[PDB]
Amino acid sequence: TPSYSLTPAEASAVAELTLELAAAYGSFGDPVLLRDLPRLAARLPEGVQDFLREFKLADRHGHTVIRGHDFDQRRIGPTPDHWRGRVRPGPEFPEELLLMLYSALLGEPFGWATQQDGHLVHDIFPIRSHENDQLGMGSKQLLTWHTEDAFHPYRSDYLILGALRNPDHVPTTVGELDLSSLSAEDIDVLFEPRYHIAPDESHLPKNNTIATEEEAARFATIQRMIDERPLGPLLYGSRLDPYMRLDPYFTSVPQDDTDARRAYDALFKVVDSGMREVVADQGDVLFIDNHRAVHGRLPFQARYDGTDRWLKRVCVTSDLRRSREMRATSATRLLG
């Protein structure tokens, strides 16, 4: 698994660029910033650009990491108690800008209209009231591994996780598919439409408002997946180095499909066993290929005192226009 370690010189250049842009641009509310992102990203050190371009085009490894960024702790400040009600942009705006630049080298940043107020850069930190929940803002509970939004046709192509702080070194579990561990007949079954991947509750049409004609048409395709329960493959792309979509919790193997349960169980075992602990420490940016890796996070104890683990997250789509039917306008990057 290749990675890139910044020299102090590159770390200084990235930090300075990031402060400069933060000063020149208001917030992510400025549409000019979004327009400018790929041009701005070409101001990053070339070695960094070449590295991510190789990763993108290589289409072989499931994740990579850029380590050794300078994330100024004094400037960044305390890990917040909640994402809601914060002054925007925060003092950590330069770091958010950084992830956005990286997202533009990989594709287009996008988000979900009902998630964290539609923010393109998401927060990941413990919220006390959320501590008995299996979600990003949790802590005590294990977040079992998953492809992000496995059921969703317009799910992330990549995820970018940047760690502003991780004092106790809590790992992000990430897992890839070792194809040689699997029967070739098992592979054949996994490539076939035999599995049902259930849509997560937050993306449910009836989960949001049933108001008006168009706000209904925005969820018609997902509603159809719920209504019709099409079966789908778990593996796809090239038979020799397949993409995968695996979220064990939302996956049903039909009871009578004996070949499918044998094959799935084989796939589940292979991926579970291959799960790696990947610590995104302060100044690390983790890149996950959503078509080649699953990920999760191990339990941890929060202090709730402003010192807790704090990651930023950007989802990336290779083709913003594919999701048009789920977007309110052509300009919006938010699904729903």
Ligand X SMILES: O=C(O)CCC(=O)C(=O)O
The reply on whether position 152 binds ligand X by CB under 6 A is no
Residue number with CB closer to its own copies (174 or 316): 316
Residues whose CB falls within 8 Å of the CB of residue 187, separated by 6 or more in sequence, listed in order? 179, 235, 239, 242, 263
Torsion angle, alpha carbons of 241, 243, 248, 251, to 10:
-120
148 is in an annotated binding site: yes
With CB atoms as reference, the residue minimizing the distance to ligand X is 172
- 286-309 b/e (C-beta count within 10 Å ≥ 16 → b): bbbbbbbbbbbbeebebeeeeebb
Rounded to a whole number of angstroms, the minimum distance from the CB of residue 75 to its own copies is 28
The reply on whether position 149 binds Fe ion by CB under 5 A is yes
Residue number with CB closer to its own copies (238 or 255): 238
Burial of 90 (0-12, 13-18, 19+ CB in 10 A): middle
What is the pattern of x (binds ligand X, CB under 6 A) and - over residues 295-324? Answer: x-x-------------x-x-----------
Residues in the site for its own copies, rule: CB under 8 A? 34-36, 38-39, 42, 46, 49-50, 53-54, 57-60, 105, 157, 214, 217, 236-241, 243, 291, 318-322, 324-325, 327, 330-331
**Binding site partner of 319, from ligand X, its own copies, Fe ion, none, Cβ cut-off 5-8 A by kind:** its own copies
Q: How far apart are CA 225 and CA 221, in angstroms?
A: 7
Residue number with CB closer to Fe ion (131 or 200): 200
172 is in an annotated binding site: yes
Q: Contact at 8 Å (CB) between 84 and 305?
A: no
Residues 197-226 that bind ligand X (CB under 6 A): none
Residue number with CB closer to ligand X (38 or 171): 171
The candidate with the shortest Cα–Cα distance to 19, out of 74, 68, 66, 72, is: 72
Residue number with CB closer to ligand X (76 or 288): 288
Mind spelling out the 3-state secondary structure of 117-180? HHCCEEEECCCHHHCCCCCCCCCCCCEEEECCCCCCCCCCCEEEEEEEECCCCCEEEEEECCHH
Total number of residues that touch ligand X (CB under 6 A)? 11
Quickly list H helices, the chain.
8-24, 31-41, 46-58, 73-76, 93-106, 184-190, 214-217, 220-228, 258-273
Rounded to a whole number of angstroms, the minimum distance from the CB of residue 309 to its own copies is 31
Tokens of 169: 């070194």
The reply on whether position 172 binds ligand X by CB under 6 A is yes
Rounded to a whole number of angstroms, the minimum distance from the CB of residue 159 to Fe ion is 7
List contacts with ligand X (CB under 6 A): 124, 136, 143, 148, 159, 161, 172, 295, 297, 311, 313
Binding site members for succinate: 172, 309, 313
List contacts with Fe ion (CB under 5 A): 148-149, 200
Binding site members for Fe(3+): 146, 148-149, 203, 295
